[PDB]
Structures are given as C-alpha cells and as structure tokens.
Design a protein around this ligand. Structure first.
Ligand SMILES: *[C@@H]1O[C@H](CO)[C@@H](O[C@@H]2O[C@H](CO)[C@@H](O[C@@H]3O[C@H](CO)[C@@H](O)[C@H](O)[C@@H]3O)[C@H](O)[C@H]2NC(C)=O)[C@H](O)[C@H]1NC(C)=O
Ligand SMILES: *[C@@H]1O[C@H](CO)[C@@H](O[C@@H]2O[C@H](CO)[C@@H](O[C@@H]3O[C@H](CO)[C@@H](O)[C@H](O)[C@@H]3O)[C@H](O)[C@H]2NC(C)=O)[C@H](O)[C@H]1NC(C)=O
Ligand SMILES: *[C@@H]1O[C@H](CO)[C@@H](O[C@@H]2O[C@H](CO)[C@@H](O)[C@H](O)[C@H]2NC(C)=O)[C@H](O)[C@H]1NC(C)=O
Lengths: 97, 96, 48, 119, 103
C-alpha cells in the first residue's frame, strides 16, 4: 500500500508536469482552419517555421477553447491526487516509523 | 562539472546542437557555415526548383592539379577578363 | 527530451518528502512507547 | 547525539542520490539528441584529422569557405535543372564576370576573353 | 534488525557508487569520441552569433542545398574550386562544361 501510494504520487506528478508543459506549448501557437483539420504554426524570425496538423477538427476553437479548459481541469485533478497520495504516505509513516 | 562543460562547449540547447540538427539522412544546418580549412565534396546536386550559385568578392580561379600539385588547365573568371588557360579548347555539338 | 528530462523533476518532490520527513524524526511519534506518567511533567535542570 | 549524526549522514546520502539521478537524466539526454556512436556524433564520423560524412548535408542557409576540393578517387559533379552560375564581383560587390551555364547553351559575360597556353 | 538495515543501506551505497562510476565512464567516452580538450573538441565551435565555424578539413559527400544556399567565399578571397586529379563537370540536362586536366 505504501509502495502504490508512492507510485500514484510519482505518476500524478509526471501527469502534472506533462499537462503544464503542453499548456505552456499551446499558449504559444498560432493556428488556422484547414480542410477538416487545423494547422498550428509558431512565429519565427526566419520566414520558415514548424507547423503541426490536428486532423478531424472542424474549427481550431476546440483546440483554443475546451482543450485548454480540459488541460486545466486535468492538471488540477492531478495535483489534487498527488497531494492525496503524498498525505497518505505522510500518515502511513506517521503511524509506521 | 564535466557535463556542464560539455553543455557549454557544444551549446546543447533545447532543440539539439545549437542550430545544427542530426537526422536519419544526415546533417541539417540551420545556420551559416564558414570553414577555415579546405572542404571536400563528391557531388553538388541542388534540388529542382532552385539555381545553384557560386559567388565571391574576387576572382573565381577554377583550376586542376596533377599528382605533383602543378596546374595543367585553368579557368579564371576575374572581374574584367575570363581566361581559359590550358593545352586546348573545344566546342562540340550533340552529334559530335 | 520532455519524456526523459521532466522524469527527473519528481526527484525535487522526493527531496521535499525527505526534508519534511527529517524535520520530524521525533515529531512523528512523540509518545513512542512505555508511556508512564502521562498526566504530569518530569524534568530537571539544576543540581541539588 | 549519534541520532542526528546518522540523520544528517543519510541526508547527505539523499543529496548525493538526487545529484546522481539528475546526472543520469542529463546523460541520457546527451546520448539521445546526439545519435552517439564510437565512430562519432550522428551518422557521420569526426575523425582525428578531419570529419567524414556519408550523408546528404542539406544546408538550409548559405555556405562559406575558401577552397572547395573534390575527392582524389571521385570526380566532382555539380548539376541542376534551371542553370548553374559562377559569379565574381568588384570591390563594390558588383558582379562583373559571369560564367553561366544556361538551360541550352553557355554564356560568358566579361570585358575580355583570353585564351593562352600553360606558359 | 539494525545490523540488517545497515547492510541493506550498504547495498544501496554500493549500487549508487557503481551507478556513478558507469556515469563517469560514459561521460569520458563522450569526452573522448568527439575528442574534446580543455578548449573543446577538435572539430568545430558554435560562434555566439550563430555562425557555425569548423576547424579542419571536411568530407561532405553529397550536398543538396534546399533553401537560400549560395555557395560563396570569404571577403577579399578567391574560391579555388580544384579537382585533385579529377574532372569538373557543370552539367544541366545535355549542356556540359567539362574542365578536364588537358581539355
Ligand atoms: C536560371 O535559374 C534561375 C532560378 O530558377 C532563374 O531565376 C528566376 O527568374 C525568374 C524570372 O525573372 C524569376 O521569376 C520572377 O522573378 C522576379 C524577380 O526578377 C520576381 O519578382 C517574381 O516574383 C518571380 O519570382 C524567379 O524568381 C527566379 N528564381 C530565383 C530563384 O531567383 C533564371 O531566370 C534562370 N535563367 C534563365 C536564363 O532562365
Ligand atoms: C584575377 O584575375 C585578373 C584577370 O585575369 C588578374 O589580372 C591580371 O593578372 C595578371 C597576373 O597577375 C597580370 O599580368 C601582369 O602584367 C604585368 C604588366 O602589366 C606584369 O608586370 C606582371 O608580372 C603580370 O604578368 C595582368 O596585367 C592582370 N590584368 C588585369 C586586367 O588586371 C588578377 O591578377 C587575378 N588576381 C588573382 C589574385 O588571381
Ligand atoms: C589527357 O592526357 C591523357 C593521359 O595521357 C590522355 O589519355 C591517353 O593519353 C595517351 C598519351 O597522351 C594517348 O595515347 C591515349 O590515346 C589517351 N587515351 C584517351 C582515352 O584519350 C588524354 O587523351 C588527354 N586528353 C587530351 C584532350 O589530350
């Protein structure tokens, strides 16, 4: 039980980090509507740039709307679950050591 | 300390070795490249859709060297004159 | 890079856990065992 | 008190542990983006006196050098689809002598066109 | 037991020690294969403006310039496009400009 509480803590921490990084990425892309898709590219000093294609997306608002809301909810839930696992370990060693 | 020295020497930024990138095919150079010593090559086949150039602020002295590094034929495109030294010249047609 | 290096940031949480554990090596279980005289205070600091 | 002595001892052990963990993370990074091999970085080889490359080194930006050579056992070839241009410029950067190989037939543009022998 | 817990702690210490040794080993291998010295590797350096300079001869094999790649040369310097005992052929379809050793 202690081992799995620690494992849940580390997995939730990894999820928090990945969600935060993905949100930080999505804060800095400019995206346009492509046929049944979205083309999100990043501004560059040189005229060339790297873009990404999100298929099966009618309008990019779904990426700029409910997607970032979903990321925020996911990171909030992940941090809450990580806190729960950490305090579970805390009580475990407060009754164990 | 040694690994930080490596990271400072090679400038391992977030995206690879600076502007240089290494892929499956080979080097992809997202920066200028000025070399101090003579380079070598095998072919220069520019992709269709662009014009391969050769420029300088001075003469372009195309030449050939034998095994003793002695000049046999030369083609110096300078500012005023375009000389073609050698042992001959020719202009042929397709049929010979 | 994001799948390799941010796998180490959890070691910072590992430190935080270790520190908060070590600031409590006697605050975890103050009573411990052999809990005699559990309604008063017994301590001295002056030789008589 | 040997108690806090042991406590700080394995606290230092913990610090050495975290430094080792982060060092392995950085070295796995340094191995990954480098395609590292005992031959050399990437698919090329950085040899002792030079560096040999067997791949299509597409320069997405200009090049500069002083001497462009060809290999001793292979003949340099340079080709395109529209044309290949050799240029030379004056001190003010004005291109003055052109050796252009157009789509059909060669052009030379200059103020003079000599031909000599080796002597 | 305190002795057994200490012995497992010693095993932890030993495994950490060997992990650090192999980390140092692979770091030396990284140092040596690129042939890095106190100044740096004897291959190249990254000038801070972005100018990728090199330090010695280069064997680039094939080259395929894609975008905005004008093979030039340094100021007040001469491009010396020499074929060491090999011809030089400017080719385009049928059109050829061949500069061989004696023609
Ligand atoms: C030799 O090859 C080069 C590259 O293919 C040819 O240069 C190209 O020339 C055309 C005709 O002018 C250019 O199209 C137009 O150029 C003007 C600038 O003059 C520009 O404002 C237009 O928007 C349009 O692009 C073309 O851009 C240009 N290509 C490059 C890469 O510069 C050249 O014409 C060829 N030689 C002969 C004799 O055809
Ligand atoms: C770049 O190309 C130009 C054009 O081919 C070269 O200019 C010519 O260079 C030759 C040899 O240096 C000059 O011949 C000299 O003639 C004088 C007498 O006038 C003589 O005393 C010298 O011993 C030598 O034979 C030639 O006059 C000159 N012509 C012009 C119009 O400049 C130039 O030298 C080339 N530069 C390099 C660095 O390759
Ligand atoms: C350039 O020199 C080479 C080496 O001599 C020539 O190749 C042969 O040269 C010998 C003697 O000069 C001739 O007897 C052979 O007939 C040549 N063989 C061939 C296939 O040409 C070569 O011919 C020379 N090129 C020119 C244009 O003179």
């Amino acid at each position: 039980y202690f081992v799995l509480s620690a494992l849940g803590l580390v997995v939730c921490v990894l999820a928090v980090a990945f969600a935060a990084h993905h949100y930080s990425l999505l804060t800095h892309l400019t995206c346009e509507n492509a046929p049944d898709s979205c083309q999100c590219k990043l501004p560059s000093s040189e005229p060339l740039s790297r873009t990404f294609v999100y298929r099966d997306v009618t309008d990019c608002t779904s990426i700029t709307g409910t997607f970032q809301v979903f990321l925020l909810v996911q990171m909030v839930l992940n941090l809450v679950c990580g806190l729960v696992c950490l305090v579970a370990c805390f009580v475990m060693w407060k009754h164990r050591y | 300390a040694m690994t930080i020295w490596i990271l400072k020497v090679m400038n391992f930024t977030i995206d690879g070795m600076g502007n240089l990138r290494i892929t499956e095919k080979g080097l992809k150079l997202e920066g200028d490249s000025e070399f101090l010593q003579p380079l070598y090559a095998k072919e220069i086949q520019s992709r269709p859709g662009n014009a391969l150039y050769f420029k300088s602020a001075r003469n372009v002295t195309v030449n050939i060297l034998n095994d003793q590094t002695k000049v046999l034929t030369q083609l110096i495109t300078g500012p005023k004159a375009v000389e073609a030294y050698g042992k001959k010249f020719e202009v042929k047609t397709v049929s010979g | 890079l994001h799948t390799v290096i941010p796998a180490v940031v959890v070691a910072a949480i590992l430190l935080i856990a270790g520190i908060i554990a070590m600031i409590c090596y006697r605050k975890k279980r103050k009573g411990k065992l052999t809990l005699e005289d559990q309604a008063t205070f017994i301590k001295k600091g002056v030789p008589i | 008190i040997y108690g806090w002595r042991k406590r700080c001892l394995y606290l230092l052990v913990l610090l050495l542990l975290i430094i080792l963990v982060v060092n392995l993370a950085l070295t796995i990074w340094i191995l990954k983006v480098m395609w590292f091999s005992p031959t050399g970085m990437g698919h090329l080889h950085v040899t002792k006196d030079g560096l040999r490359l067997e791949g299509e080194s597409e320069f997405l930006f200009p090049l500069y050098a002083k001497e462009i050579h060809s290999r001793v056992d292979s003949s340099l070839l340079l080709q395109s689809t529209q044309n290949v241009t050799v240029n030379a410029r004056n001190s003010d950067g004005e291109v003055t002598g052109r050796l252009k190989v157009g789509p059909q037939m060669v052009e030379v543009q200059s103020q003079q066109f000599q031909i000599n022998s080796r002597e | 037991l305190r002795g057994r817990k200490g012995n497992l702690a010693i095993c932890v210490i030993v495994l950490l020690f060997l992990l650090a040794v192999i980390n140092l080993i692979i770091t030396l291998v990284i140092w040596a294969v690129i042939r890095i010295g106190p100044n740096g590797c004897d291959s190249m350096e990254f000038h801070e403006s972005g100018l990728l300079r090199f330090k010695q001869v280069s064997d680039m094999g094939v080259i395929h310039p894609l975008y905005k790649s004008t093979v030039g040369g340094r100021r007040n310097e001469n491009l010396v496009i020499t074929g060491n005992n090999q011809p030089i052929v400017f080719q385009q379809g049928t059109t050829k400009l061949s500069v061989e050793k004696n023609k």
